[PDB]
């Protein structure tokens, strides 16, 4: 055998074992989710408080691309940052040439092609992150999830990390119970709950909640962080549901 | 055709005493027959008890001073915070200026 030692090598199955091994690194990471709503998207993430010595609110994991796209990821944090840095260059050159801000589907492929390129050669390592991202463009709201292989699809709801199955189950219920749609402010509250419910799969260390959102009405189509009263309101809603 | 140099006027003056030294310079900045500023300093403290002024084309003057100030900073990093002597600073400035021998800084420098 030895088919799993090098990247870009097909096994007799037709599989790239190195990419599958990168997925294990993603499964090891903290939980992160994405929720598509009426006129936008909501992102949320689990931040494990390793120590009292960590400064609260000052280790931000969710990243903005351009002014209208939000990105969150689970797995190797540095790999995610590298991916977002590329995303920003891709979005910058699009706007430079075509004037309009990059559409979300267009942006999704730019990342997809870049991640896929890292499964083509043995001189590079696959990305150790699944990335949930999206925003608002001319055609409305979009949510995407991108994997180490380069595979991505559009999503109504998306989840990845150690508590992905718990989060996926909770997301599937929202899609069933709200066929006509979910509002932006509601999605923020639900996002908090799902992170708290997904924390049951990582309950040794207590955690810190972090939420962001894009909405045509609430944020004027731009990416913003959820802070202050609106954040505490979402935490209280989540606290009430677990008990 | 584009001319990359300009004359910002002004004048500077250095005198050395026994245990001291002065470096003076007027604060007027001009182009042609117009006044740009009545107070635009061009004599700078560069650290290590070195004062510098690069009079002539102000853009090149600012660029040079900026680069020498930075040279002093990296001299400290690379040589254990050693004080840059005035004679060493002078030689360092020669290399800055001659570095652009074929597209010069149009300035008369005094430290």
């Amino acid at each position: 055998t030895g088919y799993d030692l090098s990247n870009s090598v097909f096994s007799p199955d037709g599989r790239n074992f190195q990419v599958e091994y990168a997925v294990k690194a993603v499964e090891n990471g903290t939980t992160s989710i994405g929720i598509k709503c009426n006129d936008g998207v909501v992102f949320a993430v689990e931040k494990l408080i390793t120590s009292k010595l960590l400064v609260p609110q000052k280790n931000v994991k969710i990243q903005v691309v351009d002014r209208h796209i939000g990105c969150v990821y689970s797995g190797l944090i540095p790999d995610g940052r590298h991916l977002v840095n590329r995303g920003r260059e891709e979005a910058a050159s699009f706007k430079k040439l075509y004037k309009t801000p990059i559409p979300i589907p267009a942006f999704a492929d730019r990342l997809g092609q870049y991640v896929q390129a890292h499964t083509l050669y043995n001189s590079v390592r696959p990305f150790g992150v699944s990335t949930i991202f999206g925003g608002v463009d001319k055609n409305g709201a979009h949510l995407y999830m991108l994997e180490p292989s380069g595979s991505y699809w559009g999503y109504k709801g998306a989840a990845t990390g150690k508590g992905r199955q718990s989060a996926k189950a909770e997301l599937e219920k929202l899609v069933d119970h709200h066929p006509e749609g979910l509002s932006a402010r509601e999605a923020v509250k639900q996002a908090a709950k799902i992170i708290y419910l997904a924390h049951e799969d990582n309950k040794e260390k207590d955690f810190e909640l972090e939420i962001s959102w894009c909405s045509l009405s609430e944020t004027n189509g731009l990416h913003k962080f959820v802070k202050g009263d609106l954040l505490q309101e979402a935490i209280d809603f989540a606290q009430k549901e677990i008990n | 055709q584009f001319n990359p140099y300009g004359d910002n006027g002004g004048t500077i003056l250095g005198i050395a005493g026994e245990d001291f030294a002065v470096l003076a310079g007027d604060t007027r900045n001009i182009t042609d027959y117009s006044i740009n500023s009545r107070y635009e300093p061009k004599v700078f403290d560069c650290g290590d008890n070195i004062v510098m002024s690069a009079n002539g084309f102000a853009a090149d003057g600012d660029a040079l001073v900026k680069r020498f100030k930075n040279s002093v900073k990296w001299y400290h990093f690379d040589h254990n915070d050693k004080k840059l002597s005035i004679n060493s600073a002078a030689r360092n400035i020669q290399h800055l200026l001659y570095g652009k021998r074929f597209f010069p800084y149009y300035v008369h420098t005094i430290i």
């Binding site: 090598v9 097909f10 037709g14 589907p105 991640v115 380069g150 997301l171 | -």
Partner: protein, 241 residues
Amino acid sequence: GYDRHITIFSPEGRLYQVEYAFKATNQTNINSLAVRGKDCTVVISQKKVPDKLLDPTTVSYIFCISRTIGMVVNGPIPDARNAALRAKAEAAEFRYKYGYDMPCDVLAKRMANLSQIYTQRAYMRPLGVILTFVSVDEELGPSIYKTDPAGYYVGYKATATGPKQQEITTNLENHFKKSKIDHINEESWEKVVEFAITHMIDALGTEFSKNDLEVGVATKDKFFTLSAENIEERLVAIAEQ
């Protein structure tokens, strides 16, 4: 046995990485089919959306390469999209350089030559995909040309690709034995799509709803994909006969 890891010959004159790239083709477990009419070329493919959280509109293995050319892929979506982007670029560059729209067969050859390079050069792996190009060419008429990881390509009267490809192939073979002709003798593209779906149902032995299928149609001067409602309308017509 490092001769199985990179694209160099084995003692029996084989390229194992190329052979394993063929097995990656069926990793999605999707079957595709392509047929030609008088004025058109129709391509159909199964659509499987297992996860409830997926946005089904974004789940697609059919691509619009140029205005005239369409492409369906059998294989993983990352490699599929890699191939699609390159084909789009090549088709656009061809038009700019040579002053006319790139033919379906010429694009197929170009993508096949690119695939061949990955089988000979070591640092590049083959793509685990089979690309089926379709159009109504202005010189050659209705056209179907298919490319694989080996760098092989050829034109087709009709074709099929996927896990249950052989069952679909013989189903089509038996039809053309009977009809005695190279195509589907039918005026409108609507009925050529109905033929394609009907014969896939017979071969695979499964029934299809509007969301179980994905359809692409090539006519003169444009290629387009059908919506769920366009397919539903098409499924009704089959049931009422």
